[PDB]
């Protein structure tokens, strides 16, 4: 994973996202959704999804939320106050903690001013607590600004490392982007059905035909502009549509 003071930032893009494999995986110790409850994720579409990744202690997962304070949310990773995404977290004691102490996971514990939301700060200047200038050397009131979790496998819970992923769905002003995986099911002809091909919605009885579209043509319509044929998007076969008897 990535440190807590320099988190990563992956920009998921145009794709088919299935938040159900996430939501039901039962391997996550924390799955909170803020802008939007979890079950309705596989039914919406946004412009961009960002995924941020890092590693923190066990009892610091309550500062990854909109409107908190503490050494993590103050100056390591700040979430805006109208967050939209979801926060996922799971314990990772066996991967990240090693006997003798894993001193490779640092965090920032001194900064001049709290972070703006989604702001990032990887500098390593000597902090200056008191009024006396520091001149790049340590000493009283001149502190190195980074500390390291010394993780060890015999730590009580709440001191073992947790890995965190923060998904943030954003909606700029584009034309569209990633959305869930629209469902589908087998077909059935020679019966009055409610069909739906890609968004073409109607009802009637579907038979096989003797038309020949052009490779780019997706459905046919007649005079008076009613749909009387269609192409189905998996067989590449065109089907006649006939209204279901009435009188």
């Amino acid at each position, epitope marked *: 994973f990535a440190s807590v003071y320099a988190w990563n930032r992956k920009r998921i893009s145009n794709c088919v996202a299935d938040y159900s494999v996430l939501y039901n995986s039962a391997s996550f110790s924390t799955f909170k959704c803020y802008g939007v409850s979890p079950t309705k994720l596989n039914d919406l579409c946004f412009t961009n999804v960002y995924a941020d990744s890092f590693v923190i202690r066990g*009892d610091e997962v309550r500062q990854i939320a909109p409107g908190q304070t503490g050494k993590i949310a103050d100056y390591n990773y700040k979430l805006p106050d109208d967050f939209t995404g979801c926060v996922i977290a799971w314990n990772s004691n066996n991967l990240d903690s090693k006997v003798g*102490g894993n*001193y490779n996971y640092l965090y920032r*514990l001194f900064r001049k001013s709290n972070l703006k939301p989604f702001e990032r700060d990887i500098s390593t200047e000597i902090y200056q607590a008191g009024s006396t200038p520091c001149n790049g050397v340590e000493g*009283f009131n001149c502190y190195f600004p980074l500390q390291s979790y010394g993780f060890q496998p015999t730590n009580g819970v709440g001191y073992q490392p947790y890995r965190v992923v923060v998904l943030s769905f954003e909606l700029l002003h584009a034309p569209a982007t990633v959305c869930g995986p629209k469902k589908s099911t087998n077909l059935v002809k020679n019966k009055c059905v409610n069909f739906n091909f890609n968004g073409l919605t109607g009802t009637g009885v579907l038979t096989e035909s003797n038309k020949k579209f052009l490779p780019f043509q997706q459905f046919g319509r007649d005079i008076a502009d009613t749909t009387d044929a269609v192409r189905d998007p998996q067989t590449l076969e065109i089907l006649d549509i006939t209204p279901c008897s009435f009188g």
Partner: antibody, heavy 127, light 108 residues
Framework: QVQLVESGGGVVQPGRSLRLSCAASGFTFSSYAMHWVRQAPGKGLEWVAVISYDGSNKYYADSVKGRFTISRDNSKNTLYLQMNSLRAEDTAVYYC????????????????????WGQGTLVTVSS | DIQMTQSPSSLSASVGDRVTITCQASQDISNYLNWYQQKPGKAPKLLIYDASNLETGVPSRFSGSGSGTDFTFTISSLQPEDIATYYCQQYDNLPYTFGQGTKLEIKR
């Protein structure tokens, strides 16, 4: 398991010198930190001194400096506070406690501070 | 670097109530502290790490609230064996200052 024992205090005249003993048990001693804290009888607690995992990082308090010194034995899981130039005023009960969360001190943050398994007093009169 | 904390010291209430102790912190904002109880004739004892999140053993009648420069210990549902002092230690510098204590007394 984790418990501490202390000895070395008694009655002595002012101006003299005395060293204490703060021993450990159970856990690994040379990874933690060790604090020194006191209270004059009938008053509140007061932090006295601290040292890292034998890394020579004292950062003493006010007045205390130049009169106190810290020495721990990582090989024998013991810790000694030696004080010189007494004032006939620092007569108190004294406690040593473990830390795992300081900044320029012990590597990595581990557990809670100040788990407080000590005791032991020292009288400084003329009787 | 000199800081100090305060306390509404020397309170008194009865069995089954709620008490509050407010350690207001000095300048140079900090980040969580602690809460110790001290039964007299003995050694102190940890109850809550920085801000909140008590430890083990504690009968879970205790709560903190850490928001910068003013922290409030809050105990609910008093019990007839929980009268002692209560000194809070603040950390994040060279000199780890303390509070002043809070003596507790029943009602007769």
């Amino acid at each position: 398991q984790v418990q501490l024992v202390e000895s070395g205090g008694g009655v002595v005249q002012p101006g003299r010198s005395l060293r204490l003993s703060c021993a450990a048990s159970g856990f690994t001693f040379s990874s933690y930190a060790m604090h020194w804290v006191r209270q004059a009888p009938g008053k509140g607690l007061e932090w006295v001194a601290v040292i890292s995992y034998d890394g020579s990082n004292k950062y003493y308090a006010d007045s205390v400096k130049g009169r106190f010194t810290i020495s721990r034995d990582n090989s024998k899981n013991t810790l000694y506070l030696q004080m010189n130039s007494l004032r006939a005023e620092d007569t108190a009960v004294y406690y040593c406690a473990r830390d795992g969360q300081a900044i320029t001190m012990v590597q990595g943050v581990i557990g809670p501070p100040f788990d407080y398994w000590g005791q032991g007093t020292l009288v400084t009169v003329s009787s | 670097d000199i800081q100090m904390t305060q306390s509404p010291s020397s309170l008194s209430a009865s069995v089954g109530d709620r008490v509050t102790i407010t350690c207001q912190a000095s300048q140079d904002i900090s980040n969580y502290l602690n809460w110790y109880q001290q039964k007299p004739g003995k050694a102190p004892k940890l109850l809550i790490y920085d801000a909140s999140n008590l430890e083990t053993g504690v009968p879970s009648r205790f709560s903190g609230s850490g928001s910068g420069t003013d922290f409030t210990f809050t105990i609910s549902s008093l019990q007839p064996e929980d009268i002692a002092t209560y000194y809070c230690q603040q950390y994040d510098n060279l000199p780890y200052t303390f509070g002043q204590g809070t003596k507790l007394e029943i009602k007769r």
